[PDB]
Design a protein around this nucleic acid. Sequence first.
RNA 1: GUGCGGGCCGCGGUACCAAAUCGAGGCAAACUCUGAAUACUAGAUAUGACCUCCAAAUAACAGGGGUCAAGGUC
RNA 2: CAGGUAGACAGUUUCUAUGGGGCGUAGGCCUCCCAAAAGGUAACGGAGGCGUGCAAAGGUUUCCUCGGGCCGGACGGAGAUUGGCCCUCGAGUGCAAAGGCAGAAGGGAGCUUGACUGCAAGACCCACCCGUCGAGCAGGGACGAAAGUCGGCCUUAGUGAUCCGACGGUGCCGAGUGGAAGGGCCGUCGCUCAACGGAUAAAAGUUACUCUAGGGAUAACAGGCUGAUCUUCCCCAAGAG
RNA 3: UUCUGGUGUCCUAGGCGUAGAGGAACCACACCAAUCCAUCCCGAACUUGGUGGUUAAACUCUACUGCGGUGACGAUACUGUAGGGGAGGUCCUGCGGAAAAAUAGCUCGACGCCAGGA
Lengths: 134, 60, 121, 114, 191
Amino acid sequence: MLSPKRTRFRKQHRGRMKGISYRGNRICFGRYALQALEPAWITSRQIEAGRRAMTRNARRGGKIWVRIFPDKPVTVRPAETRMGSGKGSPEYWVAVVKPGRILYEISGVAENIARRAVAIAASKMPIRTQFIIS
Amino acid sequence: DVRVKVILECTGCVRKSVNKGSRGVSRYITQKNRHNTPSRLELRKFCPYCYKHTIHGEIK
Amino acid sequence: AHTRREDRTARHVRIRKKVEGTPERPRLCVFRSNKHLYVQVIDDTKMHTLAAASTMQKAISENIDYSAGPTVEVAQKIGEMIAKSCLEKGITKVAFDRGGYPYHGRVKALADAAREHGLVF
Amino acid sequence: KKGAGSTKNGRDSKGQRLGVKIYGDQVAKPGAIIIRQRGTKFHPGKNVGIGKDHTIFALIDGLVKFEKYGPDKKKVSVYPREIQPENPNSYRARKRENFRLQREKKKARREGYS
Amino acid sequence: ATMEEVEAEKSLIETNTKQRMEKTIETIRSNFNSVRTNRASPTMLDRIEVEYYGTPVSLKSIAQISTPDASSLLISPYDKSSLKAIEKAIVTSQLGVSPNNDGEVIRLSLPPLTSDRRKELAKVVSKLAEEGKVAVRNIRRDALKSYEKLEKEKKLSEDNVKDLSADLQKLTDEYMKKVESIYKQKEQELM
RNA sequence: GUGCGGGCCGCGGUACCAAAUCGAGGCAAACUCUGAAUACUAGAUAUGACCUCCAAAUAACAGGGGUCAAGGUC
RNA sequence: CAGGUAGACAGUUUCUAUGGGGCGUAGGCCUCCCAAAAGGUAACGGAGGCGUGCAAAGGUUUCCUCGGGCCGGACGGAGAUUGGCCCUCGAGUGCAAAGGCAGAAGGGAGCUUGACUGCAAGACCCACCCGUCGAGCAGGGACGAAAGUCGGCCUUAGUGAUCCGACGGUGCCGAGUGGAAGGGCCGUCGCUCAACGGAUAAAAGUUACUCUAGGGAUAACAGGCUGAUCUUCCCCAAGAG
RNA sequence: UUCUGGUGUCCUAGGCGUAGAGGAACCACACCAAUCCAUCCCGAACUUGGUGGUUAAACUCUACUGCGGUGACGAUACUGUAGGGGAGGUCCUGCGGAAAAAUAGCUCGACGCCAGGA
Ligand SMILES: [Mg+2]
Ligand SMILES: [Mg+2]
Ligand SMILES: [Mg+2]
Ligand SMILES: [Mg+2]
Ligand SMILES: [Mg+2]
Ligand SMILES: [Mg+2]
Ligand SMILES: [Mg+2]
Ligand SMILES: [Mg+2]
Ligand SMILES: [Mg+2]
Ligand SMILES: [Mg+2]
Ligand SMILES: [Mg+2]
Ligand SMILES: [Mg+2]
Ligand SMILES: [Mg+2]
Ligand SMILES: [Mg+2]
Ligand SMILES: [Mg+2]
Ligand SMILES: [Mg+2]
Ligand SMILES: [Mg+2]
Ligand SMILES: [Mg+2]
Ligand SMILES: [Mg+2]
Ligand SMILES: [Mg+2]
Ligand SMILES: [Zn+2]
């Protein structure tokens, strides 16, 4: 589970996932990538599964890069408590993802191995994605 | 009660003055610490009755 | 580190943010070099110099004669001629800018000699 | 059912009504307050004073002006204005006098009817 | 009773439990292994010592322990003079086995499982599980008192105690299932 | 990538250990080298409608007179 | 007559907010965010602080610049003290935060008490009561050669209305008159009245033996909304087999 | 009208760095002395009074775009307003307004007053 070992503040607002990323949608590292197409939240557990599913498949020298880090808390109140009485404590961490933001990068393998492994990790995500060439 | 408010009385004013100008005594009030200033606190301040600045000293 | 010329300019700006030349009380500033004195009288609102008195003037260069640098006696002459040059213009009040240098010394003699007659400062 | 738990928060001070009171190209009387601020976000310029709380106040009657006090700072000044009046031919002047005329003529018809 | 106080009072009391629960589950497992239900014995012969030139020394240092079969054991003594000393210690230890000799080595033969033994032995297995459950219930019994002691001292609320107490039972009940799980696998060993 | 100190095998050598910096690349209500649209404040400009008509009784929208409606402060 | 002394007896009090009430937590003031580019703006919303301190850490005049990194040098080492170089506001400003301040509002030195008296045009703020800035005038003064500056502190929390009382002063009144008692006036002091716009100088609990007036504005049962949770399926397939 | 020095205002803040120029005058440094004055020690600085050696350092002038500073048009994001999709997250259209960033490009200041010199 990726998360900061330190934060200036332990709690933040929900936010607002409007627009599309015009910055983190270039393939600098790696040859083939995974590009998103919908705005949604992405947790550390999801990235952990997508990494292992992508890494466990590409045995032969498959190098991986994760272009996303959560750096956002998510609070949940204690179970079966009434409203009010403050804000709940953080439980897990979330990554804000918009259409265009690249999820992963792959190198050192063929395109057939990429489409076969990239598709498996996309099955783990909560959104629709696409395969990119560069 | 380390800090305390101190009362300053004019040295030169007299009680029950029979003058025509003005009758009374000048008296200010200020802050003053005891440990940082164990001595008295005398200062040359204005006196409306004496028509000049005079040394106002601690009454107590 | 800082040199004499740099520290001099700093001492002149800290003074200038208080004194200000006006039509009613112009600004009298002094500049002493290693071999000459120099004086100006300025109305800062108009950015114009009304009067001046230098060591290089003919009416006084023939009179005084210094070998190394201008002495206290020289400053007494500069304060005298500038005063007569001010009263003819029709001004008496003035603000004294000491040019960043200390008041003690030749600067005092220039002010006193100029304050000795005519001017009010 | 289960319970709840209080917080260690809840404190906040009310708005102290800071900010600009008079803007540029607007009249300002002597002693009138232009800015109520904490620090010198704006410095004092010409024909203007400064207070204990860095409160900038005018000294004469004129219009406010904002300048830059160096590369990356700003100040305030109050220069005198002109004395140009309005012509009687303005849409505002003709309309203003129209009320005064109709108000008197309608009055004249009130007592002048019977 | 601020939230920072509830977390601290929860952290102090709870860690004393978990650190105490692990001690019980560790020692309870040792109580099962001491029953010695004739499965395999590389361990039984370890605690028996023997005399070798005026030195009490364990059997492990004097000879090797090899298990050619689950219901037997072979001892290969390097010294024939030390062979008889091994036979003395096993009998004086009163383990419940009749050692034999073939002139070179010592062979044990664990007896079979009888019906009378299985029932009397099964009573011991259940008895140890009872001693494990009461050990947990004493910890539930000790933890809830401390929450009540904080309540009487007006450092917690009635609302906080009912939440911690109800949440503390969930912790202990998890450790309870470890007691039956160790008991289930053991009851299979009786057959 | 460079690898400060050292751990590693070591009188000083080397794969592996991270105190800074470089390049590439991200995030932030309580970060900002920058920075809108609206809003706010003030000022300036401008024929609201109808009737009767100066003239012609076309046009132009052109004057005068009259009537009505409409905004705020204390 | 006075002192002490049994709820034996009497008359009464025993706050409110609250995603029902209670147990808890909180109650006033200051700073940032939420607050949506004027101002203002709620929640048991997120972060922290105040109930002071200084006789200089005030006023005035005047001279200076911190901090970091590298290098050199006995004890001395990463780091005391000292010299120099480089970047330049990254320090510091009694304390929380924001904003501001670099020849400075920061850091020293000399003299000093304006940490004044009597005022005050005109403004900001705004239910009310409060609160804030302030040119300028007289008086008598400090610093400075002078021009000029000073009506406490770089700014914003460090605080409490009224009634009553107390101390000092006073050219006021003085129950027939003269005095006096007493009172007024001016200057100031006295409440963690913190439940902080303070119901009294003075006040806690219990009721299942109970009662009245009301409320679906407000809980428990059920219905309904929601679907965290629960139940029942589907997608990917690392592996077991 | 120019050169030197002094002194300002405006300003896109006009500086760093590199390469040149300047000593007649002007500015500056260097050298010597010390009780008007000064050093929490020190004539370095500050102050008097002297010798004139030097443009070495500073400062002034001339050039540049290597850092630095400055910075678009256009397009897009965003947004007012009238509407329309999607379970929702959120998206689209018409009219009007319109960036930041980057790049091109600009930038080694502009204008006054006094004295002296030509
Ligand atoms: Mg606020
Ligand atoms: Mg009773
Ligand atoms: Mg009693
Ligand atoms: Mg009654
Ligand atoms: Mg209540
Ligand atoms: Mg707004
Ligand atoms: Mg606002
Ligand atoms: Mg609130
Ligand atoms: Mg700082
Ligand atoms: Mg200072
Ligand atoms: Mg009487
Ligand atoms: Mg008075
Ligand atoms: Mg209240
Ligand atoms: Mg009963
Ligand atoms: Mg009964
Ligand atoms: Mg209802
Ligand atoms: Mg129920
Ligand atoms: Mg219900
Ligand atoms: Mg454009
Ligand atoms: Mg730009
Ligand atoms: Zn007196």
